[PDB]
Amino acid sequence: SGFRKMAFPSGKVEGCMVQVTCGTTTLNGLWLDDVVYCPRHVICTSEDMLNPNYEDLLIRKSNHNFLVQAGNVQLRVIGHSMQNCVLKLKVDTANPKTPKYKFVRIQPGQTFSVLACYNGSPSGVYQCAMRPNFTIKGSFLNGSCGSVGFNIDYDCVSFCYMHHMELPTGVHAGTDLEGNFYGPFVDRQTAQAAGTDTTITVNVLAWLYAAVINGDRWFLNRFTTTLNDFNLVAMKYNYEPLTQDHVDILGPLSAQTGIAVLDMCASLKELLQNGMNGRTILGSALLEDEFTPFDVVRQCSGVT
Amino acid sequence: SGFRKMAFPSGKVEGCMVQVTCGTTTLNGLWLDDVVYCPRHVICTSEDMLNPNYEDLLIRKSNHNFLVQAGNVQLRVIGHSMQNCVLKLKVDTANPKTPKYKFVRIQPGQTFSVLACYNGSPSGVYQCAMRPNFTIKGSFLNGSCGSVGFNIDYDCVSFCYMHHMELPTGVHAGTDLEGNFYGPFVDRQTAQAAGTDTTITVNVLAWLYAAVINGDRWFLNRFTTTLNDFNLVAMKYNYEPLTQDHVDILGPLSAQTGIAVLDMCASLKELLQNGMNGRTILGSALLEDEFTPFDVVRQCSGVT
Ligand SMILES: Cc1ccncc1NC(=O)Cc1cncc(C#N)c1
Ligand SMILES: Cc1ccncc1NC(=O)Cc1cncc(C#N)c1
């Protein structure tokens, strides 16, 4: 009973957080095995950030310039290398708290938990979605760079995001763990356009199924629709086009509730065209798109 | 930039979760030092739950009937005792992962993180408020009993809640770590009235300050009010009466933003009487009451 914006337990990730300092800049690093991963802009001063030449800036640095501290233990840096926008610092000690892990590049619309950190210390954990425009609407202040996003399948942590930047609009941008930015962003203090965003349609439908499962059913109606008709409404309201792949992933929820996907699409169509009429769904007065169908199944079945 | 419903990092609590089985009932326990804490209804069968005599049911049980398993390690039970609605199982081994901790009874309106667990395994973490009527609107399924709520001040975990029950209405009830229920609830399978709930006024005002800090300011107006006038509006909309103690706790946010508390109360008054007019505040289409003034300061300053 109940449905919350649940994050993964952050314990396995907490054991990986370290502080990385280079010159006068300090941010967060991720220590897995004998490598520490962090944003390459750790090597920049504020003046460098306007237009950095990272290859030139990294040439001035030596292994001993990167100060890595895990709690109180200082790590010895024996190698450094830049891969895209991340720095990989080889340390002489493998992290004893390294969980089973993978590096994955998530798709837009997918969700993950963020462990917000400052000076290598965890401050909070929250769940969020990678927007269709490759930005994340997080909660990050100066010092949070290097904080990571992840998903967990039983004992395996799939790291999918490392925080790098706050755009002038207050939204966030970052990379996968190979340092490739999600979206068109560059690690530079320059105004940068984030594309037109849309609402994650399959996630909204998944959340409508979670609402039915939890007893919120006032929005179910006597109507149905087609993928074509629904998609004309989705286009009008800046929703992602629904495909048969999305319908296929909604199958378990359709089967559990007995509500065909296109019937749920007709409920969503009516909510888009008429609003919520001052009513709420799972404690929200708007249509929630930060729960994937997988998240809804996991939370509604109690997967650990 | 940004403002999220952030939970505490759950790592220190994950290291305390164990599975407790007694007969055919299995639920979660909290292992701190050489004691395992769990709901006393672990000793009940489904038939006992209709009207349990816990003292009689516990008399039939011996130390060897309580199966406690931490991951794969089995703990040896050398004592058992009931304190209010919790069972305290003395084990022969102190939990090596016991963090610095306290047991605290929180006040209604205060917030905390819940680490939802099943079979002694963490599944997710979320932030919630203890409602003024002493219920929590969580996300809990069968097997989640014994999952705990907590707050963390640097290295100290203050455990404040243990989950016991889902009311017929889908809302949740539980105890402090001494087994005393929050609210009028009893650990019995009987319909039980949760009082009239109200919205946590000081938390809504705190969240309005967080909105101003993050750039959402469309709701600020040219008006002010008095505590008396505001409280007449609060009574009309089922909001908690605002006191000078609440105004006092909002002082840091008033100082940071330069918006006097009573001026923010006038903005809240106008939003209550007129609604949001299809607009949003920090990504919400309703007035959020699950952030205390302390949470807003902590999140807006990056406390670890
Ligand atoms: C103040 C703050 C808050 C949250 N997240 C991030 C920040 N600050 C920054 O973005 C600093 C920065 C500047 N220019 C480019 C990059 C990159 N890549 C990073
Ligand atoms: C099914 C479920 C889901 C979430 N939380 C809890 C439950 N189930 C229960 O409450 C089981 C129970 C029954 N009667 C009294 C108590 C107490 N105290 C507990």
A122: nearest CA partner in chain B? B304
End-to-end CA distance of chain B: give it in Å, rounded.
17
- A257 closest CA partner among A202, A200, A214, A198: A214
Maximum CA pair distance of chain A?
A: 69
As a whole number of angstroms, the distance between CA B20 and CA B26 comes to: 6
Ligand 1 pocket by C-beta < 6 Å: which residues? A 41, 49, 140-142, 144-145, 164-166, 187-189; B 1
Same fold, A1-14+100-197 and A15-99: yes
Contact between A121 and A17 under an 8 Å Cβ cutoff? The reply is yes
Q: Which of A11, A124, A302 sits opposite B6 (nearest CB)?
A: A124
Contact between A177 and A37 under an 8 Å Cβ cutoff? The reply is yes
Residue to mutate (ligand 1; options A117, A142, A147, A190; most atoms within 8 A of CB): A142
CA A102 to ligand 1 center in whole angstroms: 26
- A146 closest CA partner among A7, A49, A9, A42: A42
CA B165 to ligand 2 center in whole angstroms: 4
As a whole number of angstroms, the distance between CA B56 and CA B101 comes to: 32
Cβ-Cβ contacts under 8 Å for B197 (sequence gap 6 or more): B131, B132, B133, B135, B238
How close is the nearest chain A Cα to the Cα of B60, in Å?
31
Q: What is the resolution of this structure in A?
A: 1.7
- B156 closest CA partner among B30, B4, B8, B3: B8
Q: Which of B6, B15, B304 sits opposite A125 (nearest CB)?
A: B6
Look at residue B133 and give its three-state secondary structure.
coil
As a whole number of angstroms, the distance between CA A266 and CA A253 comes to: 16
- Token pair 């949470």 is found at B295
Helices (H), B171-250: 201-213, 227-236, 244-249
**How many CB atoms within 10 Å of residue B127?**
24
Contact between A161 and A175 under an 8 Å Cβ cutoff? The reply is yes
Q: Which two tokens stand for residue B192?
A: 């039980």
As a whole number of angstroms, the distance between CA B134 and CA B111 comes to: 12
- B139 closest CA partner among B7, B259, B286, B3: B7
Strands (E), A4-131: 17-22, 25-32, 35-39, 66-70, 73-75, 77-83, 86-91, 100-103, 111-118, 121-129
How close is the nearest chain A Cα to the Cα of B56, in Å?
31
As a whole number of angstroms, the distance between CA B226 and CA B223 comes to: 11
Contact between B241 and B229 under an 8 Å Cβ cutoff? The reply is no
H or E segment to which residue B156 belongs: strand B156-166
- Enumerate the domain spans of chain B: 1-14+100-197, 15-99, 198-301
Let me know the angle formed at the C-alpha of A91 by A87 and A93, rounded to the nearest 5 degrees: 145
- Token pair 């302390």 is found at B294
Cβ-Cβ contacts under 8 Å for B262 (sequence gap 6 or more): B224, B225, B226, B227, B230, B247
Contact between A17 and A157 under an 8 Å Cβ cutoff? The reply is no
Q: Which of A123, A142, A280 sits opposite B303 (nearest CB)?
A: A123
Contact between B185 and B177 under an 8 Å Cβ cutoff? The reply is no
Cβ-Cβ contacts under 8 Å for B277 (sequence gap 6 or more): none
How buried is B229 (Cβ within 10 angstroms: 0-12 exposed, 13-18 middle, 19+ buried)?
middle
Cβ-Cβ contacts under 8 Å for B295 (sequence gap 6 or more): B6, B111, B206
As a whole number of angstroms, the distance between CA B34 and CA A106 comes to: 42
Kindly list the residues from chain B whose CB atom is less than 8 angstroms away from the CB atom of residue A286.
280, 284-285
As a whole number of angstroms, the distance between CA B48 and CA B50 comes to: 6
As a whole number of angstroms, the distance between CA A286 and CA A272 comes to: 10
- CATH (residue range B15-99): 2.40.10.10
CA B45 to ligand 2 center in whole angstroms: 12
Does the domain at A198-301 match CATH 1.10.1840.10? Answer given as yes
Among the four given CATH numbers 3.40.50.261, 3.30.420.40, 2.40.10.10, 2.40.50.140, the one describing domain A1-14+100-197: 2.40.10.10
How far from the centroid of its chain's Cα atoms is residue B228's Cα?
Answer: 30
- Token pair 């667990």 is found at B117
Query: Which technique was used to obtain these atomic coordinates?
Result: X-ray
- A111 closest CA partner among A7, A4, A261: A7
Contact between A251 and A297 under an 8 Å Cβ cutoff? The reply is no
Kindly list the residues from chain B whose CB atom is less than 8 angstroms away from the CB atom of residue A163.
none
